[PDB]
Design a protein around this nucleic acid. Structure first.
Lengths: 98, 208, 151, 100, 137, 50
RNA sequence: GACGGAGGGGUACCACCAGACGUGGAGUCUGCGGCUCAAUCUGACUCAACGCGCGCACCUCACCAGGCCCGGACGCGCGGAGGACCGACAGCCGGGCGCGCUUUCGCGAUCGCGCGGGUGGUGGUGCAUGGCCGCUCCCAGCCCGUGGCGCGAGCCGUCUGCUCCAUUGCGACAACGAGCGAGACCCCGGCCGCGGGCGCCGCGGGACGGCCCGCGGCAGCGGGAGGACGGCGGGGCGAUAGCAGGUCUGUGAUGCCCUCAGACGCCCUGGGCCGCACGCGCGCUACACUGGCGGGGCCAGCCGGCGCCCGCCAGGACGCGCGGAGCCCCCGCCGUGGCCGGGACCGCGGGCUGGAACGCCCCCGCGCACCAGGAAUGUCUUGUAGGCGCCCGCCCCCACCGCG
C-alpha cells in the first residue's frame, strides 16, 4: 500500500478535519481524496487502502468515527491534530481549516 | 398545455428528504450529550442551512466553535457540498422536559448510572409534568435484573392513546439503552394539550 | 378526460348560452346550448346514432317526455369524456335535461318541466351519487376476501 | 432586462407551500407575479407489509408522500427577483428554483 | 361532419368497395396471406379485408385531422386480447407492417400528407372522403 | 493475481441505505431503503398515512 | 378468573336466514409436507402455517464441490531497511488464479513472528432480549383519587332498568368526582361557493337524526320527506392486560455459546433452492351457442412519452418530443360434433436480455384432461358480488402473485 496514499489521508484530515468512507468494493476508489503520482495524473486512493490507514489511526485514536446509514463519519481528535501536524511537517501555528 | 414528464425537480426534493434522515441519525449518534431533538434543512440557493433543535447549544458549539466547524465540513464532504457553505445553527430548546427525545437520553444515562428503574422513571416524569405535559409515561422493557423479561410501565397524569391528535399532541421517543445482561428498550410518551398551534378536537372550550 | 379545462378547445365561441355538466360513474359531459333548428350533436356525431344501439333510446328519452316542439329551436354540442359507454349514455341524457331546463331557468314552467322529468324518471335531472369503492388488502374485491384454507 | 423567470416551489406540506405562495405573490404583486399554478399533486406511494417477518394475516401500511408544486411567472428585471427571493418568507425544508 | 352523418360501418364498407374500384392502395398480396395482430390465431376470412382496413384507416386519419396520429397508434386501435393460453389473456397490438403498408399507399396517392411525427390526412384526400360521405346520405 | 479473483462483476450489488441488505431494495422512486428499513425511516422521509 | 351439552339479555354475511359466486373434480401456475439427493439453505403447522418471510440463470443466497487472499487493527518481547515484506515472465500443473512449482528478475516497512487483544460471521439460542408486528379484540371494555363494606383476597363506583354500532346514552343509585379506549379526529369521495390556473387545484361551506307525523320520563324509535348526500360512505389511528405467537436470516439492535487465515470473514468458478412414486393450500384456464372465430365501432381510471422504416410476428435500426383499455355494441361464419369448445403437452425454427439460459417472447405444426366436479368448505348486501381489462412492487428477462 503506497506511502503517498497515507500522506493524502493526513492531508485531507488537516484540510477538512474529518473524512467519510463507505464500503470495501471500489466506486471510483474513494471520490473526494486525490494524490498525484510522479508520472501519474491526479489519482484516487483505493477504498481498501484508505480504510486500512484510517482504522489504524482510529485504534491509536487519531480520529473518532460515528457509523450512520452505511457511512463512517471520522472527526479529527486533538491527539490526531498533533499527529497530522508531525505527518505534514506543519507547526502549532497551523490550525485545521475548520 | 403540453408538459414534458421529466420533472427532475420532484426527484431533487425527495433526495434532500432522504439526506435529512441520514442527518437525523448521524446527529443522534455523535451528539447524545448535547441533547439534540430535531433537524431541518433551509437548503438555500447554493448554500445549506441546517437548524438543529437541541437542549444545550454550547456543548455542540465547542471551544472556538471548533466542534461545530468539524461537523460542518464532515457533512459537506459526505453530501458532496461546498465545505463551510454547510452551516449548522444550534437552537436551545426551552421546556426541555416537554421534548421527549431529550428525556429518553436523560433516562438512558440514569439507567447506565445504575439508577433504580422506578427512581429514574419518576425523575423523568416530574420534569415533564413541571414543563406542563398533562401526562408523562415511561415504559422500560427487557430482562430487568432477571433472566425472564418484564415490561414495567411507569405513568402519571392523563395521556391520549389514539386518533390524529396522537400525531399532533404526543411526543413518542424510543431508546434502546444497553445493559450488561441485555438491551433494555425505553419509550417516553409526553402529551401536551396546549401546544399553542392546535387544540384537542374533543375538548370544547365553551363560554360564560 | 378527467375534468380537464377543454370546454372552448373543441369549439371557439359560437354564442353557447349555457355550458352544463352531467356526470355518471366518472363520465362528464359538457353540453353547450344555443338557438338552433332542434339539432343535438354528441362528440361531433348525430345524437340518434350512438354506440350502444340498444341504449340509443335512453339518449333521446328527455326529448320525448318534454316534447319535440320545446326541443325545436335549440342546438346542443356535447363532449363526453371519462367513464364508459353506458354511463356516457346516462351522462348525456342528464346533460340534455339540465341544459334544456336551463333555458327556462327559475320559471314556473321550469318547475313544471323539472317535475315532468322527475316523474317519468327521477335522477334524470339529479346526479347519481354511486362511485367505485377501493380494493382492500386481503381481498381481490373491494369487500370480497380471499378463501380461508383452515377454519 | 426583461426575460421570464420560472419559479417552482416544491413542498411536502400543503400549509407550508400555501405560506410560500402568499409571500411570493405579495412580493411580486407589483412586478406582475402570476397567481399560483398548482401542479397535480405527486402522491408518491409505498405500501409495505407491517411485519418484519411473514407471520400473521398479511397487513399493509399505506404510506403516501404528497409533493405540492407551485409554478410562478414573473416578467421583469432579473436583479429585482433575485432580491425578491430574499424578501419572500423563508420556509425551512421547502425549496424554490428559478429557470429562464 | 359528413363522415359522422353516415354511420361509421355503412361508410367503411362502401369506401372499401370504392378503394378497390378506384384502384387505391392495391393489396400487396404478400400481406394478403398474413394475419393482422399477434393477438389473433386464424387470419382474416374476408379476403377483401385489406380494402376494409384501408377505408377504416383513412376514416381514422380524417377524424384525427391535424392530430397527425402515428402508425403504431393505429396498431393500438386494432389491438385485441391474445386468447387461447392458460395464463390470463391481455391486449396485444396489431401488425405494424400491414398498417405501415396502408399509410404508405395513401402518402404516394397524396390522399394523406406527411407531417411532423405521424402523417395526417391531406386536403386532397379529405375532399374524396367527404364527397363520398354526403353521396351516401 | 488477487485482483482478478476479487469482486469481479457478475451483476449489480444493490443494498438498502441504512441496512446494507440486498433483499427488498424497494427502489420505486430511487429510494433504496429496505422494506423493513423503510418503516423505521418513513417519518423522516416524510411519508404519511391516510 | 376460566369453563358449562346452565338461565336471561344481546351481537356479527371473519355467523346464519334468503340468495349469489365459488373451491373441492380436471389441466396448469405456485407454495407446503414427504421422497430423492453432492446440495435440494432454511423460517413456521388450527384459526392467528401453506403467491407467507416483495420476481432464485450469476449476484440475491444463507446450501454443495473446488479456490483466493487479508481486508488479524493496536500494543509489547524479538527480528528487521540491502532486505521485514511483497510482485511476477516463460514452461509446468491447475475450468482456472506465480495459485503453486521450476526458475530469476523485480519491490521497500506497505513490517514479520510470538503473545495479548481485535475486526467480522445470512452460525446457534425468538423459551436470554430490544424493537417491530400478529393474535385475543371487525371487542367494548379498562381503570384512578377520596369516601363506604368486609380479618382479608377482593368489592362499591364500574347499574340484572331501558337505549345504542359502541360503559352509546338516559333514568337512577355508598358512592362522589375523573381519566383512557368509543365518539371527536384524520385521508378520501360526491355536492356548492370563492380565489387561482402549463396542469384542475387551493381555501371554505353542506347534514345535524334538524324538520314533519306517530310512539316514547328520557335516551331514543318507526316512518314520511325535502335535500348531491340520512341516519357507522369507504378507509387511517387504535384501550387495558397478556401471549413464554413470530422475526437474532432487515438492522454498528443485541446477552451468551460456537466459529475466528485449512475463516462460519470476504470474495472467485461451477451446480442447486425450480428436483419429484405422492399427499395437501392459494390461484389460473376451461368444460362452450348468453359460445368460439373473423372484420368494423369504441370505452376508462390509479395514472400515463413517441415517430419513421424494416420484420410473419417476436423484435430491430435510425431518430425525436411527446400520449389511452378490455368487456360490450354491429355484421358475417361455425353451427351441439370433445367440434372451429379447450389448450395441456411436444418437434424444428425466428427473436430478446445478459458475461453466460436452463429465463422470457414468437411461427408452423402437435391437439391432454375437462361435457359442470362426491363428502365437505369459503367469500359476499350497490356501484357491492361477479364478469372484464389496466397499472405498479420486486425485476437482465420474466405474474397464473401481491397492491392498486
Amino acid at each position: 500500500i503506497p506511502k503517498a496514499v497515507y500522506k493524502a489521508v493526513y492531508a485531507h484530515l488537516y484540510e477538512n478535519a474529518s473524512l467519510a468512507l463507505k464500503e470495501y468494493w471500489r466506486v471510483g476508489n474513494v471520490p473526494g481524496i486525490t494524490y498525484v503520482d510522479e508520472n501519474g495524473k491526479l489519482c484516487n486512493p483505493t477504498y481498501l487502502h484508505v480504510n486500512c490507514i484510517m482504522q489504524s489511526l482510529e485504534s491509536r485514536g487519531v480520529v473518532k468515527d460515528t457509523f450512520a446509514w452505511r457511512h463512517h463519519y471520522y472527526l479529527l481528535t486533538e491527539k490526531g491534530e498533533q499527529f497530522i501536524r508531525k505527518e505534514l511537517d506543519l507547526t502549532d501555528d497551523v490550525l485545521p481549516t475548520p | 398545455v403540453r408538459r414534458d414528464e421529466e420533472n427532475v425537480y420532484y426527484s431533487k426534493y425527495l433526495n434532500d428528504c432522504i439526506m435529512e434522515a441520514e442527518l437525523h441519525e448521524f446527529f443522534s449518534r455523535e451528539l447524545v450529550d448535547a441533547g439534540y431533538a430535531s433537524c431541518s434543512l433551509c437548503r438555500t440557493i447554493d448554500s445549506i442551512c441546517v437548524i438543529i433543535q437541541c437542549a444545550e447549544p454550547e456543548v455542540v458549539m465547542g471551544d472556538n466553535h471548533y466542534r461545530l466547524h468539524k461537523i460542518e465540513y464532515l457533512l459537506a464532504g459526505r453530501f458532496m457540498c461546498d465545505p463551510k457553505n454547510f452551516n449548522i445553527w444550534v437552537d436551545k430548546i426551552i421546556k426541555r422536559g416537554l421534548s421527549a427525545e431529550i428525556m429518553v437520553d436523560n433516562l438512558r444515562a440514569k439507567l447506565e448510572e445504575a439508577m433504580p428503574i422506578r427512581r429514574a422513571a419518576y425523575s423523568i416524569i416530574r420534569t415533564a409534568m413541571r414543563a406542563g405535559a398533562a401526562g408523562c409515561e415511561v415504559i422500560v422493557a427487557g430482562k430487568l435484573r432477571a433472566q425472564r423479561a418484564r415490561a414495567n410501565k411507569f405513568k402519571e397524569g392523563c395521556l391520549i392513546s389514539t386518533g390524529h391528535p396522537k400525531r399532533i399532541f404526543l411526543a413518542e421517543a424510543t431508546r434502546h439503552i444497553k445493559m450488561r445482561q441485555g438491551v433494555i428498550g425505553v419509550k417516553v410518551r409526553i402529551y401536551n394539550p396546549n401546544i399553542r398551534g392546535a387544540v384537542m378536537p374533543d375538548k370544547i372550550e365553551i363560554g360564560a | 378526460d378527467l375534468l380537464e379545462r377543454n370546454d372552448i378547445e373543441v369549439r371557439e365561441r359560437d354564442k353557447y348560452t349555457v355550458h352544463t355538466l352531467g356526470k355518471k360513474k366518472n363520465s362528464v359531459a359538457v353540453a353547450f346550448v344555443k338557438a338552433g333548428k332542434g339539432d343535438i350533436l354528441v362528440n361531433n356525431v348525430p345524437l340518434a346514432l350512438v354506440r350502444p344501439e340498444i341504449l340509443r333510446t335512453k339518449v333521446s328519452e328527455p326529448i320525448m317526455i318534454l316534447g319535440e316542439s320545446l326541443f325545436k329551436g335549440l342546438d346542443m354540442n356535447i363532449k363526453v369524456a371519462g367513464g364508459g359507454h353506458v354511463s356516457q349514455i346516462y351522462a348525456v341524457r342528464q346533460a340534455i335535461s339540465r341544459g334544456v331546463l336551463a333555458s327556462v331557468k327559475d320559471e314556473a314552467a321550469r318547475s313544471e318541466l323539472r317535475a315532468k322529468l322527475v316523474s317519468y324518471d327521477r335522477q334524470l335531472v339529479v346526479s347519481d351519487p354511486r362511485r367505485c369503492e377501493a380494493k382492500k388488502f386481503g381481498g381481490r374485491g373491494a369487500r370480497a376476501r380471499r378463501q380461508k384454507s383452515y377454519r | 432586462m426583461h426575460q421570464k423567470y420560472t419559479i417552482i416551489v416544491v413542498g411536502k406540506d400543503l400549509k407550508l407551500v400555501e405560506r410560500y405562495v402568499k409571500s411570493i405573490v405579495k412580493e411580486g404583486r407589483a412586478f406582475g407575479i402570476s397567481g399560483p399554478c398548482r401542479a397535480p399533486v405527486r402522491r408518491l406511494t409505498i405500501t409495505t407489509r407491517k411485519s418484519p417477518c411473514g407471520e400473521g394475516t398479511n397487513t399493509w401500511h399505506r404510506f403516501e408522500l404528497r409533493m405540492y408544486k407551485r409554478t410562478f411567472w414573473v416578467t421583469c428585471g432579473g436583479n429585482d427577483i433575485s432580491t425578491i427571493l430574499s424578501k419572500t418568507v423563508v420556509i425551512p425544508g421547502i425549496q424554490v428554483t428559478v429557470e429562464v | 361532419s359528413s363522415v359522422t352523418r353516415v354511420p361509421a360501418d355503412v361508410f367503411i364498407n362502401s369506401f372499401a368497395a370504392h378503394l378497390k374500384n378506384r384502384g387505391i392502395i392495391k393489396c400487396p398480396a404478400f400481406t394478403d396471406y398474413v394475419k393482422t395482430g399477434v393477438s389473433r390465431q386464424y387470419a382474416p376470412r374476408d379476403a377483401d379485408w385489406f380494402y376494409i382496413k384501408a377505408a377504416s384507416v383513412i376514416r381514422h386519419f380524417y377524424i384525427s385531422g391535424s392530430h397527425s396520429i402515428g402508425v403504431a397508434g393505429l396498431a393500438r386501435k386494432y389491438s385485441s386480447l391474445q386468447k387461447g393460453k392458460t395464463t390470463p389473456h391481455h391486449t396485444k397490438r396489431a401488425s405494424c407492417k400491414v398498417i405501415r403498408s396502408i399509410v404508405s399507399q395513401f402518402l404516394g396517392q397524396k390522399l394523406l400528407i406527411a407531417g411532423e411525427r405521424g402523417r395526417h390526412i391531406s386536403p386532397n384526400g379529405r375532399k374524396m372522403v367527404e364527397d363520398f360521405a354526403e353521396g351516401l346520405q | 493475481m488477487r485482483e482478478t479473483e476479487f469482486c469481479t462483476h457478475i451483476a449489480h450489488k444493490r443494498e438498502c441505505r441504512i441496512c446494507g441488505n440486498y433483499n427488498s431494495v424497494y427502489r420505486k422512486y430511487g429510494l433504496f431503503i429496505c422494506r423493513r428499513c423503510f418503516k423505521e425511516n418513513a417519518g423522516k422521509i416524510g411519508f404519511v398515512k391516510l
